[PDB]
Design a protein around this ligand. Structure first.
Ligand code: CDL
Ligand code: CDL
Ligand code: CDL
Ligand code: CDL
Ligand code: PEE
Ligand code: PEE
Lengths: 67, 110, 53, 37, 230, 107, 51, 48, 110, 22, 52
């Protein structure tokens, strides 16, 4: 995986925390997985906002947490 | 206008001597009326393709003057390739026969 | 003004600038060797310089 | 250009592996897996 | 500019000898969003029919407990919604967003049965439906349209500009550039036309061989990356 | 609330920087040259590296061979040179500097 | 070591060795006899005579 | 994440701090190392 | 390459004296660093538009050599407009100062 | 060639400066 | 192999007339087309209404 965390602003990720759950498709079979938004929000404490990439829509984590 | 590349290719085939033998063989059992009708039909097919496809399609050369610019360019190409070449030859001819401007000289004074 | 005519000087005009876009390239390019390496086998250089590898 | 090509291949071949957190020659320095036994 | 999109499909294009043609309009013109860099007023406006969206909006607002917004938007939106034309988000994109962000299957099914497959949600609709800002919804729509920039966008037609000055400069150009023997040169006929014509003929004949031989490595790398990820 | 501000596209789509190329090493050019000097087969002008080429260029610049000639040696090449003749004609607009050139040779 | 040197020009595009222009007094045509009639073709610009 | 082939190369390397050191080791501290993805690998070592 | 017409229009505006007064007014409260950064950003935006849009889009001038032909044509236009003009002037200068071919004359024989 | 179609819609087109890409 | 593109005729007639036609066509591209197609549009409308 990459160190590219999407900005949770609605201009980038519409409807991030409107509901308490996130979902993802996994693998070639695209298995479903549901994740709590708090488990996800733990990442944005390690996110560094000086760094912004890919049209300034993705921030970077600190290397300690990412690794 | 369209298919200029195909027209160049047609001229190349026509100037090829192998194609002359091929045409000699194809002319067996054939009439001048048939040949003329075939050529006329080909030209009509080209112009009809234009008349139909211009209604909905645009070529890479499309411009605010349309096919007028392409036809002008065809004319200018013909002019510079054929007529100016003939003019060069006529100029050298007149210059060798009378001198430069010899065809516009005044009559001998009486 | 006999000896003062070769003293009227004018500077050159060449600009040594050329942009270097390497983002366009992804392959290496060859490069010349300009001088022989004397930092290695210095003592033997007159004795092996005439041979070709 | 050589460096560009090298990094451009490193991206595709390292960034999505899940097996290359670093280079294998330095795996001695990693912490140990609690799940292996 | 960045290459946006969630797609892993290595896609290349081949060109034709025909230009893109759109229906005639006396006020609008079609262009590429990244090349135009259009602004909100450069975008063209049209009127959209409300009722199909307003029914769903009334339902959603009756659930969420904010009817002031529905009333305000409906009083705004009577006689249709005047809105910039090519600033929208597709139903499929919106459903993907809802699903990944955790909206329930009942809500998603409501969306699916309510709207047709080819419906297009504009930024004011999104803003009133999710209690967001029209600015943010506009920016989201623009990003999602730039993700698919092969589709041209409709702008207000503007006449050409600086034609007189351009005419003067082009006259100056031809006057200085064709007053020479460059196109009648031995250098031209010996090097420029032969080298150029040979490059053109070889490129035309091996157009696809070359591209394939170049793209082999990139295709293999993308395949490897996707497999490792999976 | 309705949107009325005219939103530019630079607030949304940011262009990449491509005018000046990337530095994947994240180090300046003089520091690269410095490290190359202590790398092997990369000393000042030895080797086939760009550092070797740059040092060779500086070496020939530091040398005399590309300096201008002296006044004792100007009539060997310079006074019969197209650059010299064109510059003389250019900076003497409506004149003919052949005679002054002859006198410069005499000098 | 007291005689002067002739100017040198050599590149892929042009040179000064395919011909001789002569001295200031004793001049001569740089081009040879077969291409003298086609001098216009060896020029980027040409300003013809007045006659 | 986005597709890594869509991602800009220098942006990826700015995000990644480890493979930065891998590039500096072989291409900043040396000038003659091959432009391959893995110069430390056994094939390269044995070839050297 | 792209937006050649816009570039011609930009040159026309630049040569217009009214725009000189407009720029004089716009330069109030402005820095050379800001101007340089603005110009550099404009050039980067152009080249970035190319790098992005070439991946999926084709212009009317698309050809089996791509933008190489457009860049060659830009170079050739520049050459014929500027450099050959300068060559003409230099030719007339040399012909008035020394005679035609005066810069390639041999040194005076000793 | 003949203009086929069952449509009564008077349709004209405007062109762009971009080519069709497949 | 000619002086056609360096001609007084060129610079006096060919480039001015052509450039003026091009500029006018570019500036009044749509006005012209609309003024031409007005009659055809009206005729098609009339025919469809009569048929209906
Ligand atoms: C003389 C030619 C040789 C030049 C000198 C020798 C130099 C040799 C080196 C050649 C290197 C070329 C440089 C390549 C760099 C890339 C340039 C480029 O591609 O963009 C060009 C540029 C287009 O830029 P763009 O970014 O693609 O924008 C397109 C627009 O959106 C518009 O969108 P659109 O879809 O509506 O149209 C797209 C495009 C479509 O263009 C085409 O597809 C070509 C048009 C028809 C197909 C056949 C073309 C060839 C024959 C007909 C055209 C003759 C002119 C030759 C034009 C050369 C280019 C093909 O339209 C045009 O650009 C118009 C071009 C034709 C101008 C006709 C002017 C008539 C006056 C001249 C008298 C008639 C000719 C005399 C005989 C000359 C014989 C040499 O075209 C312009 O010049 C802009 C015109 C702005 C109006 C200015 C005021 C009017 C003055 C008109 C003269 C314009 C200057 C050119 C002089 C030519 C006439 C003397
Ligand atoms: C050291 C020795 C050498 C020293 C001498 C050096 C030589 C200097 C000569 C001066 C000219 C320099 C070159 C620039 C030329 C203009 C090119 C240009 O931009 O025009 C494009 C212009 C705009 O067209 P576009 O780009 O397609 O569309 C843009 C819009 O128009 C939108 O454009 P816009 O919004 O930017 O402006 C529009 C403006 C367009 O009007 C123009 O075309 C501009 C012409 C103004 C020339 C002023 C020259 C000033 C320097 C000389 C001093 C003169 C004393 C008077 C000072 C000004 C006080 C009145 O007006 C109009 O369109 C009509 C409405 C009127 C509005 C009021 C305009 C006047 C403003 C007040 C004056 C501002 C003074 C500025 C301060 C200057 C400080 C240096 O259209 C034209 O081409 C106009 C026709 C071309 C003019 C010549 C007409 C044919 C006569 C030719 C001369 C006869 C043949 C030669 C033989 C004569 C033997 C004696
Ligand atoms: C008694 C015994 C005596 C024995 C004799 C002994 C002899 C003496 C002792 C010798 C001792 C040994 C010394 C060593 C030998 C010395 C040799 C020496 O001194 O040289 C002097 C000698 C000349 O001396 P000279 O007295 O000055 O001669 C008269 C002048 O040279 C005449 O000049 P001209 O009027 O003919 O004009 C020529 C023109 C020629 O200039 C051009 O060719 C320009 C054409 C460009 C058109 C396309 C440009 C597209 C870009 C557009 C840019 C944006 C648009 C902006 C608009 C404006 C710009 C267009 O101007 C230039 O040359 C400018 C040169 C500076 C630019 C160089 C560019 C290098 C870039 C390389 C790129 C590398 C890419 C690698 C990719 C690998 C593949 C993946 O050298 C030459 O022969 C000159 C020609 C050299 C060839 C340069 C060609 C560069 C073209 C690069 C094309 C890039 C495109 C790549 C395409 C492929 C990728 C798709
Ligand atoms: C020198 C020019 C001035 C001529 C003499 C003065 C006369 C003035 C009067 C002008 C009147 C023009 C006549 C208008 C009638 C309509 C003609 C027409 O539109 O269709 C043309 C015709 C295309 O017919 P088509 O029905 O549209 O079929 C398109 C295909 O499906 C292919 O589909 P596609 O999508 O892949 O490509 C479409 C199209 C796309 O075409 C474009 O959009 C233009 C290309 C790039 C944009 C900028 C154009 C201007 C600057 C770059 C090109 C320089 C050449 C100027 C070409 C003039 C046309 C723009 O591609 C081409 O047609 C290739 C044209 C460029 C040929 C480059 C040859 C390089 C050798 C020459 C050395 C380099 C130039 C030296 C400097 C010359 C400066 C004057 O083009 C051809 O000539 C067919 C080539 C077949 C291969 C033959 C073997 C190779 C020999 C190459 C030379 C070809 C003959 C032309 C000589 C030009 C080079 C000396
Ligand atoms: C020896 C250990 C060092 C190894 C190399 C590591 C790199 C060290 C980096 C130091 C950077 C120094 C920067 C120098 C900038 C110079 C600035 C400058 O250009 O000013 C000009 C001025 C020169 O002016 P001129 O002498 O008049 O020449 C004019 C040209 N016609 O610059 C200098 O003086 C630089 C002096 C250093 C020149 C380089 C010396 C190269 C010597 C080659 C080796 C020769 C070995 C022979 C030994 C004898 C054997 C029996
Ligand atoms: C196709 C094959 C072409 C090959 C041509 C390559 C020729 C390479 C030969 C040049 C290097 C020769 C080494 C000379 C060392 C002499 C011993 C020495 O230490 O002398 C020092 C002395 C410096 O002292 P001064 O001149 O007094 O300056 C005072 C300081 N201001 O060194 C010099 O003179 C420099 C010598 C300049 C060499 C001539 C330059 C030739 C230009 C070549 C560049 C073009 C590229 C050549 C093709 C690439 C071949 C790999």
């Amino acid at each position: 995986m990459l160190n590219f965390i999407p900005k949770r602003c609605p201009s980038v990720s519409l409807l991030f925390g409107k509901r308490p759950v996130q979902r993802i498709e996994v693998g070639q079979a695209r298995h479903q997985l549901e994740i709590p938004v708090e488990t996800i929000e733990k990442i944005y404490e390690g996110v560094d906002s000086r760094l912004e990439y890919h049209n300034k829509d993705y921030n970077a984590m600190k290397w300690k947490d990412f690794m | 206008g369209f298919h200029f590349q195909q027209y160049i290719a047609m001229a190349g085939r026509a100037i090829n001597p192998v194609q002359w033998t091929r045409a000699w063989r194809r002319m067996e059992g054939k009439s001048a009326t048939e040949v003329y009708r075939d050529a006329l039909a080909w030209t009509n097919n080209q112009f009809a393709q234009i008349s139909r496809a211009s209604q909905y399609r645009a070529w890479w050369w499309q411009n605010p003057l349309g096919m007028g610019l392409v036809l002008y360019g065809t004319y200018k190409a013909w002019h510079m390739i054929y007529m100016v070449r003939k003019q060069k030859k006529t100029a050298q001819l007149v210059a060798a026969a009378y001198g430069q401007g010899g065809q516009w000289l005044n009559p001998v004074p009486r | 003004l006999l000896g003062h005519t070769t003293s009227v000087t004018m500077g050159n005009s060449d600009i040594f600038f050329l942009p270097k876009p390497s983002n366009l390239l992804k392959i290496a390019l060859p490069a010349f060797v300009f001088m022989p390496n004397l930092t290695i086998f210095t003592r033997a250089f007159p004795f092996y310089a005439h041979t070709s590898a | 250009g050589k460096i560009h090509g090298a990094v451009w291949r490193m991206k595709h071949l390292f960034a999505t592996n899940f097996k290359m957190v670093g280079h294998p020659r330095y795996a001695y320095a990693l912490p140990k897996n609690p799940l292996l036994q | 500019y960045a290459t946006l999109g969630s797609g892993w499909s290595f896609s290349k294009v081949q060109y034709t000898k025909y230009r893109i043609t759109k229906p005639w309009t006396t006020d609008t013109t079609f262009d590429d969003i990244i090349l135009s860099q259009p602004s909100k007023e450069d975008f063209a406006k049209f009127t959209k029919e409300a009722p199909l969206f307003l029914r769903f909006l009334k339902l959603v607002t009756d659930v969420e407990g904010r009817q002031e917004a529905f009333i305000q938007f409906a009083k705004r939106c009577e006689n249709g919604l005047t809105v910039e034309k090519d600033v929208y988000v597709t139903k499929k994109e919106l459903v993907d967003c809802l699903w990944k962000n955790g909206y329930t299957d009942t809500e998603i099914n409501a969306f699916e049965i309510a709207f047709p497959a080819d419906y297009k949600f504009h930024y004011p609709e999104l803003a009133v439906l999710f209690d967001l800002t029209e600015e943010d919804c506009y920016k989201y729509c623009i990003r999602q349209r730039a993700a698919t920039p092969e589709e041209l966008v409709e702008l207000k037609y503007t006449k050409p500009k600086n034609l007189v000055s351009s005419y003067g400069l082009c006259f100056l150009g031809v006057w200085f550039g064709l007053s020479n023997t460059v196109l009648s040169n031995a250098w031209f006929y010996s090097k420029t036309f032969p080298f150029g014509a040979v490059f053109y003929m070889l490129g035309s004949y091996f157009y696809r061989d070359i591209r394939e031989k170049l793209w082999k490595e990139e295709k293999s790398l993308i395949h490897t990356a996707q497999e490792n990820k999976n | 609330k309705t949107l009325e501000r005219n939103v530019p596209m630079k607030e949304i789509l940011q262009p990449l920087w491509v005018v000046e190329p990337p530095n994947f090493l994240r180090q300046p050019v003089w520091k690269q040259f410095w490290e190359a000097q202590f790398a092997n087969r990369s000393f000042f002008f030895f080797g086939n590296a760009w550092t070797s080429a740059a040092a060779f260029a500086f070496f020939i610049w530091w040398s005399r061979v590309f300096d201008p000639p002296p006044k004792e040696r100007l009539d060997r090449y310079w006074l019969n040179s197209p650059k010299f003749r064109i510059l003389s004609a250019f900076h003497n607009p409506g004149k003919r500097p052949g005679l002054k050139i002859s006198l410069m040779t005499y000098e | 070591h007291e005689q002067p040197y002739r100017a040198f020009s050599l590149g892929f595009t042009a040179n000064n060795l395919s011909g001789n222009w002569g001295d200031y007094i004793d001049r001569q045509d740089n081009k040879n006899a077969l291409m003298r009639p086609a001098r216009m073709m060896f020029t980027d610009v040409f300003i013809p005579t007045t006659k | 994440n986005p597709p890594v082939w869509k991602v800009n190369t220098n942006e990826w390397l700015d995000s990644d701090q480890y493979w930065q050191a891998f590039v500096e080791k072989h291409h900043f501290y040396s000038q003659y190392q091959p432009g391959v993805v893995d110069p430390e690998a056994p094939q390269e070592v044995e070839a050297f």
